[PDB]
Amino acid sequence: INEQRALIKSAHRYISEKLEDHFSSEFLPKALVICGSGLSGISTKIADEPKPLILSYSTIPGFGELIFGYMNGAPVVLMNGRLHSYEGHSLAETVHPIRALHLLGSINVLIVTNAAGGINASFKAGDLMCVYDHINFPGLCGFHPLRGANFDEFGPRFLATSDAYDLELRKLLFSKKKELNIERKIHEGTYSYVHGPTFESRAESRFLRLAGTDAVGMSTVPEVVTARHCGWRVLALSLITNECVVDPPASAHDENPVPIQEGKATHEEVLENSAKASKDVQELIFSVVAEI
Amino acid sequence: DINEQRALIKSAHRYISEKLEDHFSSEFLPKALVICGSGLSGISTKIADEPKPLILSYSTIPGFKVGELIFGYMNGAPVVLMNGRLHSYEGHSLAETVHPIRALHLLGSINVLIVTNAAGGINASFKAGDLMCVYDHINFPGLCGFHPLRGANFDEFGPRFLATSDAYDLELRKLLFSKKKELNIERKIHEGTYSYVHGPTFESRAESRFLRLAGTDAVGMSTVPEVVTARHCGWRVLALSLITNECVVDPPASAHDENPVPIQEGKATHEEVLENSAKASKDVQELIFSVVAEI
Amino acid sequence: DINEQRALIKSAHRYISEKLEDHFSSEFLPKALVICGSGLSGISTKIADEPKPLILSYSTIPGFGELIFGYMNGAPVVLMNGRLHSYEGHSLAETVHPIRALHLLGSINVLIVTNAAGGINASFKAGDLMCVYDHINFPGLCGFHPLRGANFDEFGPRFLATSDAYDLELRKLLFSKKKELNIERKIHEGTYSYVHGPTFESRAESRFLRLAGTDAVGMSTVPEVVTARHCGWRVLALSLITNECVVDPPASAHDENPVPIQEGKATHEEVLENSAKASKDVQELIFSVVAEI
Ligand code: HPA
Ligand code: HPA
Ligand code: HPA
């Protein structure tokens, strides 16, 4: 833990010095925006003045790029590039940026998006889901970002997660949907984090629905839990990029079977629907960030 | 590396056995191991002063990591107490966590594990302050690969494939309820299923709802690896959970609610767990003290 | 680490390939890998004497129990006799290594795999078979996943669908051969749940598995299935129901005439006894199926 602490310190030391050298007045970001699915182009919405700062991950200790600048009048930090647990990284590596950035002392809000399969039978690809709760499946079984010695200078040994998704931020999001007259459906529901990288089988999706899942994805919950451990408020927004297949597969006894490949999830589909929802998601987040 | 685990178990047992020989006048053959989790932090005081008990710090015993083992007579019965158990969420391997059970099994006399812990109430009828006699468990991490028997089998202790459908001895549970009645303890003792989850987070609302749906009556971050290991060694097991808090299961306030309930309302805290553990300690302590005397 | 796994896979394939070329006078291109789990331990005896089969002990193959290469019912196959179960402490990469090594031969397009399983579906009886047409990979959902790590781009996609994991035509082939062979043994079609083991499930765990949609539970096979699919192979999976899981709640301390909690408990002895009983049928089924893959 003591070496993790050193890495986090070194990272903060590097970042804060770049900031004070780059910005005329002290740059104190209010929000970290993990620019996942839907948010690939929101950095273009960063204001020209003051000139934004772009730090490559490669030059930051423990860390793709961080972008520092003003967005709709508000000072933010953007993460373009994230580490997914299915790539083999430890969860400490995944959430290192949150802990490093916490040391700036100004960030109080995490805004994070991701792609997700719709488990709720009412959801359609293209819909969004504002996350109000989650199930951390890997967390229940030992794959937990807080496993190990507690970072006492950050948060408590035992962290409650029944209050993870700030109600006021969710109300802010829906007020901006209405204000912008965005017609895209925004559900409110439970996000289940599963490790991946497989898409769910039919039986797995049926299990997840039975378990109370509205949408399933392969990221975000470790970052949410770590941000909550640091005391941050969290807004999480899922893009429903595909409808999960839940019907039993064709029986060998069926006269006219539905092909088992029919409607199967693909990364191509995820990418295509992420791009379609991108303008709405970026404009929603653009509006929300000003009022934080 | 089962070899190196074996070496650790053997050296720990060597150390313990030799200390017992040096300390006690007569041979000391404990019949039970009591793991003193929540509500049992004080039961070491009930160990008889005569003959003088032996205290072994985890720091002085091989393989033990930290915490102490206390060897003595409780209510006329020779026992070993474990104070200061290890937890997986702290980063220890499950091997490290259950190592004490294997080391103590080599004394050849222990045939019962008695374990206590704190648990969140998942069953809607449970209240803070209630107890739950455990009659079944769900080993969630174990199903997924975080399992105390993972690795080469300790064939000198038990079978490669261990049944767990019979983990919680019926006669010991009946004894528990007998003593409850004998002691006139008015505190409720439920009978139910304990689910082991890794922690160290308290469950989200959806997580608790999932646990409830899966058949959980109480949830905690300990005990099941020790139970499974004790069963692999062929011991009987009595497990008792302190319901320290009622898990929040209702959905959080909707952004569309005009009169939303604060999402932090009723949130679990370690402070509440400690406070309720303490309020229950007297009853839990008298209960176990009474049980050990009748095997 | 993917560097190391790739080196092992390359070295294993080279060793196997060289042995095949020396051993068989004609080029040997197996079309199926048969993982000879429960019910299949004797199927190697149905390998044709001519051409003489090649047996490769695991201890001589890099990264690897024996591999048997030969002709079965006219078809070139490789048999895995010996598998590595995760509960023994092996990584999932080591467990599925043979599939990636053998994929480099460039001819296998089908995995046939058997295993023993506990019946979770209340209608299943010991002695029944279950043709798998879906699974739940509980360990995989929670992080214990054979594709965890950098992706093997040479084999398949970063993100793999598993809603189509159990080939329909192969399942129809299996049931056709059951009919043709006049096998009266029941063959269910349902969902296999993989759990780590090595414990047999508690009553509460089985009850949980049942409500999750499990028909049969076992401690193997799903990581192999997922890996074969990642390689683009078709999969036929067949479980032997070797015991009926204990699911009823245990006796209450308040019961007057409690049912003994030990009654009906699972034992490895029972698993092996029932695997033995079903073995003739399972071998006859797989033998006839490979002729048409
Ligand atoms: O169907 C899905 N499952 C898991 N993660 C996902 N991310 C996008 N779609 C999915
Ligand atoms: O709510 C809880 N969850 C998990 N472990 C616990 N130990 C006491 N309360 C709880
Ligand atoms: O009951 C069982 N559970 C898990 N694996 C099994 N393999 C055979 N029977 C079982």
Author numbering:
A (entry chain C): 6 to 68, 78 to 306
B (entry chain A): 5 to 70, 78 to 306
C (entry chain B): 5 to 68, 78 to 306
List passages from the publication reporting this PDB structure:
PNP (PNP: E.C. 2.4.2.1) catalyzes the reversible phosphorolysis of N-ribosidic bonds of nucleosides and generates a purine base and ribose-1- phosphate. The homotrimeric class enzymes utilize 6-oxopurines as substrates, while the homohexameric class enzymes utilize 6-oxopurines and 6-aminopurines. In the present study, we report the structural and biochemical characterization of K. lactis PNP (KlacPNP). Based on the observed oligomeric state in solution, KlacPNP can be classified in the low molecular mass, homotrimeric class of NP-I family of nucleoside phosphorylases.
We report the crystal structure of KlacPNP at 1.97 Å resolution and observed an extra electron density at the active site. There were three molecules in the asymmetric unit, corresponding to one biological trimer of KlacPNP. All three monomers assembled to form a trimer having a non-crystallographic, 3-fold symmetry. A catalytic site is formed in the vicinity of the intersubunit interface, where Phe172 from adjacent monomer participates in the formation of an active site pocket. Hypoxanthine remained bound to the protein throughout the protein purification steps and crystallization process, suggesting high affinity of hypoxanthine to KlacPNP. In addition to five potential hydrogen bonds between protein and hypoxanthine, two indirect water-mediated interactions are also observed. Similarly, in the crystal structure of KlacPNP, the structurally equivalent Asn256 forms the hydrogen bond with O6 of hypoxanthine, which is an end-product of inosine phosphorolysis.
